[PDB]
Amino acid sequence: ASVTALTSNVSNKRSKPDIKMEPSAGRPMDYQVSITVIEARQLVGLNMDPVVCVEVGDDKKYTSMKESTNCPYYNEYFVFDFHVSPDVMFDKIIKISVIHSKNLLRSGTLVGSFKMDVGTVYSQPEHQFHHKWAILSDPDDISAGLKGYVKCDVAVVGKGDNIKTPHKANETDEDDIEGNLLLPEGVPPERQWARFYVKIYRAEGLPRMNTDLVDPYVQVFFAGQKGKTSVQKSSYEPLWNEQVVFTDLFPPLCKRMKVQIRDSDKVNDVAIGTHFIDLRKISNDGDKGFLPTLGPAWVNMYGSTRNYTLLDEHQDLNEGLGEGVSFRARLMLGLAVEILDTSNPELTSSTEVQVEQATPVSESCTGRMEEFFLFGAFLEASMIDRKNGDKPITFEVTIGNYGNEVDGMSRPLRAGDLASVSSTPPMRPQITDRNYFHLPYLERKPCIYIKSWWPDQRRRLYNANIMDHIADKLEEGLNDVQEMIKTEKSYPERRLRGVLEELSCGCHRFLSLSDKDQGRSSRTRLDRERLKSCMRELESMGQQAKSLRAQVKRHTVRDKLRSCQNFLQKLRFLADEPQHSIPDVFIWMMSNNKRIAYARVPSKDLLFSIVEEELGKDCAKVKTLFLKLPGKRGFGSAGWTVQAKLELYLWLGLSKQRKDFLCGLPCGFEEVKAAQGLGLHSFPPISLVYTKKQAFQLRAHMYQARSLFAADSSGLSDPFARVFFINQSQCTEVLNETLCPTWDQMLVFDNLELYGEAHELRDDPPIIVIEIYDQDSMGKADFMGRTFAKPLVKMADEAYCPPRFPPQLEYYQIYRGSATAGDLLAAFELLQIGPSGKADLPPINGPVDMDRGPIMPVPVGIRPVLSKYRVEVLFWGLRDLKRVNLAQVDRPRVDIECAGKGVQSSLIHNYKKNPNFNTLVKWFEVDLPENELLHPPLNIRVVDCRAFGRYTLVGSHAVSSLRRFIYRPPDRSAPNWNTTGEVVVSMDESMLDWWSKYFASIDTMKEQLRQHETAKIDELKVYPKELESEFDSFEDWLHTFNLLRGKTGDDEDGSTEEERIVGRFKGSLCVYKVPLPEDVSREAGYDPTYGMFQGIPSNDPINVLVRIYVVRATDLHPADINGKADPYIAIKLGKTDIRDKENYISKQLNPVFGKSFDIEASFPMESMLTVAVYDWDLVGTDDLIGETKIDLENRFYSKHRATCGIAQTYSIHGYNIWRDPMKPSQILTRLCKEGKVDGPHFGPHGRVRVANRVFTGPSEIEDENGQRKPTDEHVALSALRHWEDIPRVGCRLVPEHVETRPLLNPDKPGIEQGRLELWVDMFPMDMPAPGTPLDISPRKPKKYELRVIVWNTDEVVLEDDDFFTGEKSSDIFVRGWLKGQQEDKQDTDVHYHSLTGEGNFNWRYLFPFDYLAAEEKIVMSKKESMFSWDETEYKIPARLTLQIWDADHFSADDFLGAIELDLNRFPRGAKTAKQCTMEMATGEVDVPLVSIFKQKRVKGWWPLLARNENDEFELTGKVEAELHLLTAEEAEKNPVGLARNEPDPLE
Ligand SMILES: CCCCCC(=O)OC[C@H](COP(=O)(O)OC[C@H](N)C(=O)O)OC(=O)CCCCC
Ligand SMILES: CCCCCC(=O)OC[C@H](COP(=O)(O)OC[C@H](N)C(=O)O)OC(=O)CCCCC
Ligand SMILES: [Ca+2]
Ligand SMILES: [Ca+2]
Ligand SMILES: [Ca+2]
Ligand SMILES: [Ca+2]
Ligand SMILES: [Ca+2]
Ligand SMILES: [Ca+2]
Ligand SMILES: [Ca+2]
Ligand SMILES: [Ca+2]
Ligand SMILES: [Ca+2]
């Protein structure tokens, strides 16, 4: 590829800071874990009744009990719902266990368990595992072996996540367990046991917790286990030297460990601080990796404010559930992993959590204590919330507990006797405006200085600073590439190649810097191993960056960019230091000593170094901080207002390195120092008095906004924008009833004073805060959003000349919290008033409209150049207009306005009889910018026309981008438009049904979704998503515009976007430049009454028969207390509201409906199709599982012909019968007549000519009896299948299909909780009517009867011992069933007192059962319990179970052995009892497998196995059996009796 690259910034993203006002982390979000326990195999137990218990967090659910099987089958679906933050969510433990003998009084005996947290599932490629086997292990015994496997799906979805879900085909497979384990990639299939020594040494700096002492201990949580140390009573500096040892599998699938200091109290046990150790960050896998190690090193814990209160509203911060607002404690800590030798018998095999005495460590192992100096300079404090600032305001800086004056001296003491001044002097605020204050610092900036003592682990922070510097440059470069992609700047591939080259240079630079301290003795094992890992990963990263730079091309910019995103995330993951050294710096606003708002600067960001890459990104720089409310108060409505805005200079480093700690400040200040600092050059000042000052003038060219927040009940706003710069604020004018105001207003901040000649003021200007506000009637203003900007600084010596000046308008992203609230098209420049005064400034011109007066416009050269455009609007109709106020909408009219100009539609004089417009096409002319990116949005605004000029607003939609509707002149010289040149294109049955072709299409789709990851059945096209997702929503000529009314909801609660829809406007737009050329006009026709919209179909009402075929549903959300649902299909279309409550499928979460519903709807009025799934309830209302909206109006009028899908092949009989009443010849004739194509010209019956192309195919049809007639329909359907290749009006037609539409619940938004497979046919009733609906009803199971003649038994173990003489014997009888123990169990008579294991039975079982051949499942209908309302259909595997039992007269019968013959895959029986061995039933592949549905008679010997105390299989008996499968029709013709009875007796 090309080698040319760009290194510098081109796209001006640096003038748009992405300031996060809220922390944007730890926000709660709806999560869902769906777990489908499919089956289990090879479970360890004797006569076990296994129940799978599935826990996610604390909630646990159970499957049904399967009786007397070591390989049960469940196919049961569980859904766990949570509303928690992602860190809490991913720490939840998914535990899949198998228990037995559980009843109402006794907890079940545990067989085996599997542990894996939610975050392991979420880190999967599709956030899920599909068809994987959980390795069960004994969690209480390290010497125990494998306890079985549980095949299961585990999936995690957040709000708005999309998962490719595989379709539920017939799983008639014998897939390998060991090749499909439930483990992440890189984890070995056999996992050893290991011990996690969480050594806890001591803690320092604890706050008050009783009123006033504290009694701390440390509780450690790991993988669901917990253990705690002793309580060190009455100590702020506790000392434990105690290790908490967990025994768990390695490598652990629960990857976070929660260390938590707690205070012991008899009233309530309370948390002090919480730190999470990430095991990913302290370990590496593979042979080159290392075991999880940490320490002995300090760890910093953060939480609530340390002042004592009786009730703490920020107690969740002490639990680690949010960002900490104050320093709580620091804790020496270590972690070690020792892999246990499980074969060695000397150590104990128990797994319970030990608390032992750890070996104490010295303080010198963490690094020698060094004196750190922190300096601050509050250059500016503005934008303080007026709800607090009636009283004087201080700013207190604290690092650790140093400088915490108000909460007490919990500080050890480690210039001479320099007293730390950590708080600014109090000063009364002055009014900026009605919402904000500012402190009048002016020339006197207050300063702070804090002396602290920390261990000298600066090397960790330096390495993190280097790698975070590389990550910062990479993130800035990727934002540059994305922004120049979005604004369509030329050649983004050069910028991406330069970014990759710079990333490779930084990765090479890290390796030369990080090895300069290898000789340090105060260096943990984690430091050495992580340094080696980071060096290896960054060298591999530099090589991968060079390789990816070699692959960047023009068309491949958009897919190498996400490849660089995982580089960015790997640098961010590696850049976090798990061994904390210096705690973060906190800056707090106070008033009357009450803590109000905080900022938290990371300590490594302020650290000083000689090397530029080791230097922190905020060290010796003026940092813009936005203080926020602590805890949950910074979220939502309370966190909307800016609490404060600081320009805070900060420096941190050693006290030996503080010679240049004032170098980053603006020049021209005099240091005012305390009484201790008189005559001392090195003493830091308590304030700066600036003598230099520079006059400035900021111009805010606020031209336009778009897509703004709606803060009025009409769905609109009255937005005006307030611009904040330093200590001043100015407002634009209020524009009424719009969400896209064109203010066109320049705000001039005259004679500003910038104190001090700032270092690099051109490259780092002060930030501008822009706040939108909805003006209201009696005087308040709703917060409408906030964006940030950086002005283009023009110095006095600079010329106001291109290419830098005048600044162009750019879009600044507006936010309300975290939600996007539109864009602000504005430009900002910061012009210095020179020595000559204001004459050097560019001229300020008067307004074009003289009535505006003192309001200045955006000047020429900054405002966009306008050109004439014509917007042509098609007014197709208005659908589903909801009630405005209480009344109905009766005379609607559509006013469409763009950039002040506009047109109004014809008034619909009566909405009910015909919601249509008399004039279909109207147009207006409007000046729009040359740049298509700067085009203002077009507003659709439907009003209800009452009498006497009184209009009420029904709804409003904002078309944000007009570029979809922009008519460029099409290229008709392309070879696709060529219509000349001849092109030639060439081409046990009676048991098939629609399910045959459906399963064939499902298999074809399943292999087609695996192709890109690297007799014959005619098929259809199964879509994994909606049909709209394939055919671009059928919006080829007709578009939908959802009208909205009411206020937009908040980011957490309130209204939602789908609730605010009060109607739909049907129509299209076509925007083109004026004048349009005449040849372009005649290429598009341009009839004067239709404009650009040629080929528009008839607007008249037409009756349409809508036939909805509902096939099945998958993964339905449970809506009953038993974890299941009783789904039925409820379809709403127009006035027809079918609710099929009589045909519900009871207790099924994957129902097979097989239904068809006929609804006659008057199109285009009755066109919103709502197919819903409802859980039927015996008492109370039926619950909505989910629903989908299909919008048949787009389907009916589309050029894709979405009315009826066209089949792959044509026939008039059988499973592939042609559904459409219009034959393929008629469809081809209609498509040629509508498209004005010459044709279809049928010559001989095997060919047709459509335009320049000739199709050929078979020429004869089959009329159901083997006889043939000549026909034209095969070649017509071949032409219809290749209709996309037609040159002039060719189009990909909709095939016969089954679409998978997600089911959405408004009560549980954002999470898909169902997948309804369906398809919709539409037939106009003025055409000939279709026939009967297709029989897509589910397959009736074929009736069978399996006859199992148990002849004899041999070598049965003798269970009984004689009480008087002592010889062994056994009362052998055989127990057999096919469906279950409570439904098909039959026992032979007892062969009493067998002294050798030989039994003689000659006993015939009969097992009548219903069978589905495709699913290989026995179908049976039975009640779930005795107290149940209805019979439930169950599908179980066809498995014959034969068991040997010993009959006891005075006790229960004793289980001896069993075999579970799968009737499709059971081994062949041996010819004699001698040839029967252990290897037939176990995992040896050398024994061939036989299906009884093919062989139809198998006689032989089979082994019966039982597990002893050593958990191994042993041969406890052999049985001779004669399986003989018959149909029911064969069984009635040849009847036999039970046991030995007539007919066909047995001896
Ligand atoms: C007394 C026995 C209580 C047993 C526990 C209990 O509360 O059962 C509620 C039952 C079942 O209702 P659902 O299946 O919708 O609740 C399940 C829910 N949708 C979910 O999915 O969580 O309803 C009634 O008894 C009728 C109430 C209204 C009567 C007018
Ligand atoms: C012979 C007695 C029959 C009694 C039949 C009866 O009353 O059934 C109602 C329910 C059981 O109904 P389903 O679980 O099938 O719920 C149906 C569907 N899933 C729903 O959601 O509603 O009974 C109980 O809860 C305990 C009753 C104890 C009565 C002593
Ligand atoms: Ca206490
Ligand atoms: Ca309002
Ligand atoms: Ca308002
Ligand atoms: Ca229910
Ligand atoms: Ca129900
Ligand atoms: Ca209900
Ligand atoms: Ca016995
Ligand atoms: Ca006995
Ligand atoms: Ca017994």
Automatic annotation (TrEMBL):
GO cellular component: basolateral plasma membrane; endoplasmic reticulum membrane; Golgi membrane; presynaptic membrane; synaptic vesicle membrane
Any one GO biological process: sensory perception of sound
Major site of localization recorded for this protein: membrane
Residue ranges constituting the C2 domain according to the UniProt record: 13-134, 177-293, 680-805, 852-978, 1076-1205, 1326-1477
Compartments, record wording: Basolateral cell membrane; Cytoplasmic vesicle, Secretory vesicle, Synaptic vesicle membrane; Endoplasmic reticulum membrane; Golgi apparatus membrane
Topology of the protein relative to the lipid bilayer: Single-pass type II membrane protein
Keyword line: Calcium, Cell membrane, Cell projection, Coiled coil, Cytoplasmic vesicle, Endoplasmic reticulum, Golgi apparatus, Hearing, Membrane, Metal-binding, Repeat, Signal-anchor, Synapse, Transmembrane, Transmembrane helix
MF-aspect GO terms: metal ion binding
Subunit structure: Interacts with SNAP25; the interaction is direct. Interacts with STX1; the interaction is direct. Interacts with RAB8B.
Record family assignment: Belongs to the ferlin family.
Its job: Key calcium ion sensor involved in the Ca(2+)-triggered synaptic vesicle-plasma membrane fusion and in the control of neurotransmitter release at these output synapses. Interacts in a calcium-dependent manner to the presynaptic SNARE proteins at ribbon synapses of cochlear inner hair cells (IHCs) to trigger exocytosis of neurotransmitter. Also essential to synaptic exocytosis in immature outer hair cells (OHCs). May also play a role within the recycling of endosomes.
The protein's name: Otoferlin
Native organism: Mus musculus
Section of the entire sequence shown: 238 to 1930 of 1992
